[PDB]
Amino acid sequence: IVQQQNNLLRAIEAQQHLLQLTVWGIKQLQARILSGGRGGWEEWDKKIEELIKKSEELIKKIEEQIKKQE
Amino acid sequence: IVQQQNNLLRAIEAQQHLLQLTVWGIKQLQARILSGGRGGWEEWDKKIEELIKKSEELIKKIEEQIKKQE
Amino acid sequence: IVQQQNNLLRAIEAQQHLLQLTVWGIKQLQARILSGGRGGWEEWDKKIEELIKKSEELIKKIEEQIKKQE
Ligand SMILES: [Mg+2]
Ligand SMILES: [Mg+2]
Ligand SMILES: [Mg+2]
């Protein structure tokens, strides 16, 4: 349960980076295809950014707790 | 390992909401760009919906188990 | 904490499959809409593929550790 939580965290991290990459691709599609590009997507961007930040801190939080144990 | 599992769950949740937001954006792209909009995407929608539901229940399940401990 | 880690893993898995499905949808959008289709996306594809593989192994790793306990 020691190395278990560590791999859970690492999996969560990878999924995080995945998610960020899909966000980038979807943004590129808006930019390339839509006549107004990323215009009007501002609020969707803010919601995405808020959850990425929240995710990033929790990750950091988990990392800290883990090594406080170690 | 107490507050560890709780932050893992919360991270999983955030990623969940992220994922839902990317799904929304991809659906908007289908709707706005494709001549037939979201037409023909029905099965992809069903697969997405099935995994979101599965995810949501597991989250709930984790939450319950956690506080049954508390 | 026994059945807790197991549901965390399963949630992570579901999110994984979700993520793969969004990747598929974004690839279909590139293919259908862009004049050059998926052309020029090769590096983005490689980054995605690298993180999916990493994710898949960690999942497998978690599964193994879990039942080594059981
Ligand atoms: Mg347009
Ligand atoms: Mg069309
Ligand atoms: Mg074009």
Numbering used by the authors:
A (entry chain A), B (entry chain A), C (entry chain A): 3 to 72
Which text from the study accompanies this structure?
After the binding of the gp120 to the cellular receptors, gp41 undergoes conformation changes after fusion peptide (FP) inserts into the target cell membrane, exposing N-terminal heptad repeat (NHR) trimer, and forming the six-helix bundle (6-HB) structure. Peptides derived from the HIV-1 gp41 CHR are potent HIV fusion inhibitors, which specifically interact with the viral gp41 NHR to form heterogeneous 6-HB to prevent fusogenic gp41 core formation.
Interestingly, the crystals of three different inhibitors belong to three distinctive space groups: P21 for N36-L6-AP1, R32 for N36-L6-AP2, and P63 for N45/AP3. Compared with AP1, triple-site mutations were introduced in AP2 and AP3, i.e. M44E, R48K and E49K. Those substitutions not only increase solubility of the peptide, but also trigger a series of rearrangements of certain intrahelical salt bridges to improve the stability of CHR helix structure and HIV-1 fusion inhibitory activity. However, in the corresponding sequence (from W43 to K76) of AP1 and AP2, a hydrogen bond was established between S57 (corresponding to I642 in CHR) and Q18 (corresponding to Q565 in NHR) in N36-L6-AP1, N36-L6-AP2 and N45/AP3. However, in N36-L6-AP1, N36-L6-AP2 and N45/AP3, I54 (corresponding to T639 in CHR) can strongly bind to L20 and L21 through fully hydrophobic side chain interactions.
